[PDB]
Design an enzyme around this catalytic site. Structure first.
Site, PDB file in Angstrom:
ATOM      1  N   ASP A   1       0.838  -1.194   0.000  1.00  0.00           N
ATOM      2  CA  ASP A   1       0.000   0.000   0.000  1.00  0.00           C
ATOM      3  C   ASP A   1       0.877   1.250   0.000  1.00  0.00           C
ATOM      4  O   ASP A   1       1.671   1.464   0.927  1.00  0.00           O
ATOM      5  CB  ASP A   1      -0.922  -0.016   1.217  1.00  0.00           C
ATOM      6  CG  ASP A   1      -1.715   1.269   1.380  1.00  0.00           C
ATOM      7  OD1 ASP A   1      -1.799   2.082   0.435  1.00  0.00           O
ATOM      8  OD2 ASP A   1      -2.269   1.464   2.472  1.00  0.00           O
TER       9      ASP A   1
ATOM     10  N   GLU B   1      27.332  14.798   9.494  1.00  0.00           N
ATOM     11  CA  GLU B   1      27.775  14.810  10.884  1.00  0.00           C
ATOM     12  C   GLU B   1      26.523  14.774  11.740  1.00  0.00           C
ATOM     13  O   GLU B   1      25.800  15.775  11.814  1.00  0.00           O
ATOM     14  CB  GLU B   1      28.589  16.062  11.186  1.00  0.00           C
ATOM     15  CG  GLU B   1      29.679  16.354  10.206  1.00  0.00           C
ATOM     16  CD  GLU B   1      30.429  17.647  10.527  1.00  0.00           C
ATOM     17  OE1 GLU B   1      29.803  18.632  10.995  1.00  0.00           O
ATOM     18  OE2 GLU B   1      31.656  17.677  10.293  1.00  0.00           O
TER      19      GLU B   1
ATOM     20  N   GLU C   1      24.273  14.398  15.168  1.00  0.00           N
ATOM     21  CA  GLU C   1      24.267  14.659  16.598  1.00  0.00           C
ATOM     22  C   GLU C   1      23.075  13.971  17.242  1.00  0.00           C
ATOM     23  O   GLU C   1      22.010  13.856  16.630  1.00  0.00           O
ATOM     24  CB  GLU C   1      24.225  16.158  16.871  1.00  0.00           C
ATOM     25  CG  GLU C   1      25.308  16.887  16.142  1.00  0.00           C
ATOM     26  CD  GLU C   1      25.493  18.303  16.610  1.00  0.00           C
ATOM     27  OE1 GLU C   1      24.645  18.795  17.365  1.00  0.00           O
ATOM     28  OE2 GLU C   1      26.485  18.945  16.218  1.00  0.00           O
TER      29      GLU C   1
ATOM     30  N   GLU D   1      29.627  16.065  22.277  1.00  0.00           N
ATOM     31  CA  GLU D   1      29.298  17.373  21.740  1.00  0.00           C
ATOM     32  C   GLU D   1      29.059  18.324  22.926  1.00  0.00           C
ATOM     33  O   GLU D   1      29.272  17.954  24.085  1.00  0.00           O
ATOM     34  CB  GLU D   1      28.125  17.190  20.769  1.00  0.00           C
ATOM     35  CG  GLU D   1      27.859  18.235  19.689  1.00  0.00           C
ATOM     36  CD  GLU D   1      29.044  19.042  19.223  1.00  0.00           C
ATOM     37  OE1 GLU D   1      29.795  18.606  18.323  1.00  0.00           O
ATOM     38  OE2 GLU D   1      29.198  20.164  19.734  1.00  0.00           O
TER      39      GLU D   1
ATOM     40  N   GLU E   1      28.254  13.104  18.761  1.00  0.00           N
ATOM     41  CA  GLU E   1      28.287  13.322  17.323  1.00  0.00           C
ATOM     42  C   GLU E   1      29.034  12.166  16.681  1.00  0.00           C
ATOM     43  O   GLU E   1      29.950  11.593  17.274  1.00  0.00           O
ATOM     44  CB  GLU E   1      28.958  14.668  16.951  1.00  0.00           C
ATOM     45  CG  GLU E   1      28.900  15.025  15.470  1.00  0.00           C
ATOM     46  CD  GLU E   1      29.540  16.375  15.161  1.00  0.00           C
ATOM     47  OE1 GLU E   1      29.029  17.425  15.629  1.00  0.00           O
ATOM     48  OE2 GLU E   1      30.571  16.391  14.451  1.00  0.00           O
TER      49      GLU E   1
ATOM     50  N   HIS F   1      24.681  18.459  10.346  1.00  0.00           N
ATOM     51  CA  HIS F   1      25.504  19.222   9.423  1.00  0.00           C
ATOM     52  C   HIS F   1      25.771  18.396   8.177  1.00  0.00           C
ATOM     53  O   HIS F   1      26.080  17.202   8.255  1.00  0.00           O
ATOM     54  CB  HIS F   1      26.817  19.636  10.076  1.00  0.00           C
ATOM     55  CG  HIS F   1      26.646  20.564  11.234  1.00  0.00           C
ATOM     56  ND1 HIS F   1      25.416  20.836  11.794  1.00  0.00           N
ATOM     57  CD2 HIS F   1      27.549  21.288  11.938  1.00  0.00           C
ATOM     58  CE1 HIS F   1      25.570  21.679  12.801  1.00  0.00           C
ATOM     59  NE2 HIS F   1      26.856  21.971  12.907  1.00  0.00           N
TER      60      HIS F   1
ATOM     61  N   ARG G   1      33.539  30.002  12.169  1.00  0.00           N
ATOM     62  CA  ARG G   1      33.088  28.615  12.255  1.00  0.00           C
ATOM     63  C   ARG G   1      31.568  28.490  12.301  1.00  0.00           C
ATOM     64  O   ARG G   1      31.041  27.396  12.066  1.00  0.00           O
ATOM     65  CB  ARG G   1      33.704  27.931  13.480  1.00  0.00           C
TER      66      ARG G   1
ATOM     67  N   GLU H   1      29.920  23.323   3.826  1.00  0.00           N
ATOM     68  CA  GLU H   1      29.251  22.801   5.015  1.00  0.00           C
ATOM     69  C   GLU H   1      28.038  23.673   5.339  1.00  0.00           C
ATOM     70  O   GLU H   1      28.186  24.824   5.766  1.00  0.00           O
ATOM     71  CB  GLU H   1      30.230  22.743   6.189  1.00  0.00           C
ATOM     72  CG  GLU H   1      29.627  22.361   7.520  1.00  0.00           C
ATOM     73  CD  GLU H   1      30.678  22.301   8.628  1.00  0.00           C
ATOM     74  OE1 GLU H   1      31.387  23.319   8.828  1.00  0.00           O
ATOM     75  OE2 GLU H   1      30.781  21.247   9.301  1.00  0.00           O
TER      76      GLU H   1
ATOM     77  N   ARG I   1      24.920  24.199   7.763  1.00  0.00           N
ATOM     78  CA  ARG I   1      24.826  23.861   9.176  1.00  0.00           C
ATOM     79  C   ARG I   1      23.407  23.907   9.760  1.00  0.00           C
ATOM     80  O   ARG I   1      23.212  23.455  10.896  1.00  0.00           O
ATOM     81  CB  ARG I   1      25.762  24.791   9.959  1.00  0.00           C
ATOM     82  CG  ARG I   1      27.233  24.608   9.544  1.00  0.00           C
ATOM     83  CD  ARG I   1      28.173  25.596  10.224  1.00  0.00           C
ATOM     84  NE  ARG I   1      28.217  25.413  11.669  1.00  0.00           N
ATOM     85  CZ  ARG I   1      29.179  24.762  12.312  1.00  0.00           C
ATOM     86  NH1 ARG I   1      30.198  24.218  11.663  1.00  0.00           N
ATOM     87  NH2 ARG I   1      29.106  24.641  13.638  1.00  0.00           N
TER      88      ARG I   1
END
Lengths: 442, 442, 233
Positions: free
Chosen positions: A52, A130, A132, A187, A194, A243, A314, A331, A333
């Protein structure tokens, strides 16, 4: 490696696999599965499996529901636990309509058309995500809590009690299922962890994101703990993101790397960023899909609430790691582990491809602390914010020509009707915070 | 009647009054007070009373804060409890800056300027408010709860236990202070009640809504109960409004009445409705002032979430009751009893006056059920809805030139900065409802 | 003195407690004893001058200068217990910086707008645990010293002192009140103004007793330390 059904059937007999679990997701990211007795597996390869299709698109509408899954023997994977009865394995497939055309409401199919659009332009996409999570305790009845297992902080060697052995057993299970983890670490928040995965093709990686979450949750349960992928299970501590590191490849080489440019990034890496910035607000509803996602997207923690890019900072919404050569990556985030990875990765790709094709400039980087600025200064810099709650995300995506075309009308309109219902339910709840603040006051 | 300060001093001596309480409000509606011994009162009439103006305007800025209250004898009113120590009264007055100019930041001053604006055009404004509240139990420590005192419904004869006496005692206390109640009844929700003020002069009526709140609360507290003016203490039942009936008068005649029209309503009444509708969106943050206010402004209950006017329909935002002649009135249904009545009535008066000045037609009535319609139908009809949460109401007010000039800049900005802080605190809170929906899912 | 035990006994007899702690509860306001003061001569208020722009007399500024000069040296008296310096932390009604002002309500010394026979100076830092005979005498002496020696109070501070940098306030030359009892003790032990005002017997007794109170408190291991460190170390 399995490629033919003869490989898989040979592997099922040799390894004594007794159960074969299918693995897909619904429009909204929920993991779905049914169990195939390994006795049925040879007929499933020969003829497919009727199921289904409301398992994917829900019951809301009268629409065709008699779908057929054709098993992909290359996606066959044995799970890292050994019941007395014999072994278990997962497998994936391509969903077809009775007329023989592919079902376009299958999120994995949406990633495939995005993959197809890239190959048309000569590229393929690699992603290393990555992930978490929190590791919480169970209560006396075995049910989830938000009770901590440690009070460690960023990169702490914690926990050191029996939760240490449970964490090690999670990493071992994924490693010996073939995930090839890069590293894992505690983390910022207490009990938060992580796991960094290796870079692989986006399709292979999305399949592994789905496997990862239920593999981890099951291993934790069976040791007496709970692994939580909630965006923000606790107030005042970090939320959990997913990430998403990405690069394009062509001709065996990283399209984003340019040895000759001052920053060693190619012009097409800048266009890919510009197209991500142009459209990210239009699909935060997809990368940040539940009400709680917007309790992580508030100022104060790791999470990025402003739209910008940077190499030196960062924290920006888009960051460029120092890595060059074939490991040059972008990256993004903002996503969290609740997002349907097929949809999140598909729109990420379409946006960057559209940036490359239409030459979309990303503007100057934002190397300063944005949260330290004042709203006047952020306006002067053209620094927009992400949608601040699920509803504002709903309204941005509801108007997006880019998101409707990348997803298709079925997925686009189901996703929105389902999310709008979720928001209308939440926006009426009277919360204990309100009684605490108002009951004695008014 | 109290007319001169000698009237008040004789009554204090004759009725053994030992304490006088001042009565005022801060910007955000909280009721403020300080106690004056009867021995200090004649000096207080002579020189005014110095006090800290942070009580009205808050601490957040460096601004003049030495204020002077000049006592208005005609507002002297004895409170309806008799301590063995002796009687207690309340009094109001006018707040001045040390240079001798009136303090523009006192909400009651803001109302007085609106009254002056209408008098410049011939009119004075009556209001009869209808105050809803719950009566709840106290826990073992005498703390407020939301525990019910009956399971009654609309106009029921309920409660019939010890709480029947408390309800009667509340009616008695206000009536024999001199409120002149018209009627009280059980309202739709369990434990919910309503008291209908007398249609009276707007300034004196706003003084009465403040008195009403602490008299009712204090009466119930001393009987073992709690009176709650929260807009929405309980999900799934009716919230509590403060519907505001209003009319204008010139030369002692009700200018909303015209015997020679079919509706028996004048045109100025229609222009007044037209002005109210033109600006109600822009000051929903004043009529509906807290986060909880927007749990009541959801469909399904007595609350109006759609901008419209009607005579027939009880659902409308503005309803025109059947009464004609001297009691012809317009009922605005959206306010809740947490608002600052000084500001809420002032803005109502200014919106309607702007309609009569600019001859703003209200459009057609709406005699249908608006909740039953579809968006395109409401869109076709041009039926817009109210702000859906406090933040949306903050954003609407912040852009409104009409609200700023009516309130004055000091009040306007102080109000918005404080509501913006309350919203930013709320929006980050992780609520139990999110753990229930997602903790096991994600 | 009468007030404190009267209020306490009344509250006890109704079933409640009246507390004069400086900071009974973290994260809300503490309790102060703001001390408004007027000086009178020949029947007239020494601080009032109808002819100056602010209508304050010159002796008013000299009185303020004297208080500003010596206040650090008897914070130990106006703020007598360990808990007193949990109230003298930034964030609340408590004045933790040495300055005067008419405009800023939160300055250490405040001038209310009232003029005439009611012209007054509010000294805001004391708390209700202080001996009021010792506090009011030291304020009086300090003000008197300012008038006798014509001590200028400097400029008023009209801005938010908290919202300045540590250099910003050093640019302004704005000092802090002592951060804890031990610091207030050390400021007072080296003060000739305080020693002469109290007399040697009071000066020495007071300091030895407070020094013992601090030497007791500084060795206590508080439950906040276990919460912060037991898992960590």
């Amino acid at each position: 490696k399995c490629t033919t059904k003869e490989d898989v059937l040979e592997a099922v007999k040799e390894r004594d696999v007794k159960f074969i679990r299918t693995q897909f997701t619904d429009t909204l990211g929920i993991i779905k599965s049914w169990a195939i007795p390994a006795e049925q597996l040879e007929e499933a390869f020969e003829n497919g499996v009727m199921f289904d299709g409301s398992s994917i698109q829900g019951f809301t509408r009268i629409e065709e529901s008699d779908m057929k899954l054709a098993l992909d023997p290359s996606t066959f994977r044995i799970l890292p636990w050994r019941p007395a009865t014999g072994a278990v394995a997962r497998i994936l497939g391509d969903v077809y309509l009775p007329d023989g055309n592919p079902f376009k409401g299958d999120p994995r199919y949406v990633l495939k058309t995005a993959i197809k659009e890239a190959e048309k332009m000569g590229f393929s996409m690699n992603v290393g995500p990555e992930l978490e999570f929190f590791l919480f305790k169970l209560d006396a009845n075995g049910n989830p809590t938000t009770e901590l297992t440690d009070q460690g902080g960023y990169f702490d060697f914690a926990p050191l009690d029996r939760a240490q052995d449970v964490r090690r057993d999670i990493d071992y299970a994924l490693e010996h299922m073939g995930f090839q983890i890069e590293a894992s670490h505690h983390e910022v928040a207490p009990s938060q962890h992580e796991i960094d995965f290796r870079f692989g093709d986006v399709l292979c990686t999305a399949d592994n994101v789905v496997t990862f979450k239920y593999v981890v949750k099951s291993i934790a349960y069976h040791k007496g703990y709970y692994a939580s992928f909630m965006p923000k299970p606790l107030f005042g501590v970090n939320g959990s993101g997913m990430h998403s590191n990405q690069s394009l490849f062509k001709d065996g080489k990283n399209v984003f790397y340019d040895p000759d440019t001052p920053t060693k990034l190619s012009q097409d890496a800048m266009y890919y960023i510009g197209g991500l910035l142009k459209h990210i607000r239009e699909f935060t509803a997809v990368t940040n899909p539940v009400v709680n996602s917007y309790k992580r997207l508030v100022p104060g923690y790791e999470a990025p609430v402003y739209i910008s890019w940077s190499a030196q900072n960062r924290s920006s919404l888009i960051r460029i790691p120092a890595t060059r050569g074939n490991g040059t990556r972008i990256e993004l985030r903002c996503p969290d582990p609740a997002c349907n990875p097929y949809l999140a990765f598909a729109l990420m790709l379409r946006a960057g491809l559209e940036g490359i094709k239409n030459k979309i400039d990303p503007g100057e980087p934002t190397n300063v602390n944005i949260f330290h600025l004042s709203d006047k200064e952020r306006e002067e810099r053209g620094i927009r914010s992400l949608p601040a709650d699920l509803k504002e995300a709903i309204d941005e995506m509801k108007g997006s020509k880019f998101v409707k075309e990348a997803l298709g009308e079925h997925v686009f309109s189901h996703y929105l009707c389902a999310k709008e219902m979720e928001w209308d339910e939440y926006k009426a709840v009277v919360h204990p915070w309100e009684l605490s603040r108002y009951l004695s006051m008014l």
